[PDB]
Amino acid sequence: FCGKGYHLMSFPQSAPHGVVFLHVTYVPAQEKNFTTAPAICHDGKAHFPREGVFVSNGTHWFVTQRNFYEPQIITTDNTFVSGNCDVVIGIVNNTVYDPLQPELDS
């Protein structure tokens, strides 16, 4: 509706008998393949991303925001738990890091 891409903002300019909109959009540019999974199995519990998507660089699993590659360690602040690891099709095992474990150990 406001240009091609994800609309950011628009600026109007007057023209004879009409109007010209300068639409500013965000266009994703340089995509890279990744291996992905719907959920992560850690301790017999299925984990799902709170905001992003699980991606593998080939050996290591990260969670990233969906529209810009920004890989982050998979932690319990990153994810939420729902159910065991038996229903989800395509679940993979990986560790889900607990931020409070080192603090309790320290």
Partner 1 sequence: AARDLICAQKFNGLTVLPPLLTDEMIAQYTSALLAGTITSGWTFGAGAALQIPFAMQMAYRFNGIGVTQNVLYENQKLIANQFNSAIGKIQDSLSSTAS
Ligand X SMILES: *[C@@H]1O[C@H](CO)[C@@H](O)[C@H](O)[C@H]1NC(C)=O
> Which residues lie near ligand X (CB under 6 A)?
31-33, 41, 93
The per-residue b/e assignment along 74-99, b for 16 or more CB within 10 angstroms, e otherwise, is bebebbeeeeebeebeebbebebeee
The DSSP bridge pattern shows strands 40-41 and 46-49 to be antiparallel
Tell me which of 46, 55, 63, 74 binds partner 1, using CB under 8 A: 46
Minimum distance from residue 30 beta carbon to partner 1 (Å): 9
Q: Which residues bind partner 1 (CB under 8 A)?
A: 4-6, 25, 27-29, 31, 36, 38-39, 46, 48, 53, 66, 80, 82-83, 87-90
